[PDB]
Amino acid sequence: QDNSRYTHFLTQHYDAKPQGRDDRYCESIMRRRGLTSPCKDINTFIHGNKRSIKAICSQKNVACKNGQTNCYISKSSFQVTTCKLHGGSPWPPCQYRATAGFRNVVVACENGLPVHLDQSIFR
Template sequence: MAMSLAPLLLVFMLGLVSIPPTLAQDDSRFTKFLTQHYDARPTGRDDRYCERMMRRRELTRPCKAVNTFIHSTKDSIKAICGANGEPYRGNLRISKSPFQVTTCTHNGGSPRPPCRYRASSGSRDIVVGCEDGLPVHFDESFVHL
């Protein structure tokens, strides 16, 4: 009897080993999203904030043209992919409630550091791309409210 369970045990163990990398891959896309777009407690929301955050988040090699930071909790951002979001063009979802954001726009000039940014802040609905219930893409083209 024990011999006949060995193949099943092997298949079960192989299944367990193969699941974490898949989950880790999903989490890595969400982690990258958070690195690029999440700042729960901003200190100032002016041009210096943008220049500091863009450098700190390694978005200046080359200078990224536009980047938006969302000032909220991770759970409320995740909720856009669920109860606090509605379908919006393809796999995108739009938030049902506004978020505080700061958008950093490169002032032009050289795409190499030092990068200079102009900040614009406000409250707006945001559009994200979701995979497996997690935001993995911020849609930069959505107009401020």
């Protein structure tokens, strides 16, 4: 009955309607979601309907970058925003450079729910 993994996924990779998609947006959402202590080197947010993200789990199964076999790639593209830390210091303030895009996403699923985003793809 524990769904903290799915909720942890949303908390770290989901933002239905971003208020922007620039550096200002990244520096704001990163702090709001708790990814600023220490500064997370890179993180990607997915925008759109939450039901569309869950639907990826019932699509084409593919191998994860780490070796695991429970990854799935989206059929269609999603609007995403990737925030890459500027410099290298893990100590805040954390400055971010944003890159917005429209592409397919690969997520690891568990019992039909996305639990991890295969980040390696947005580096």
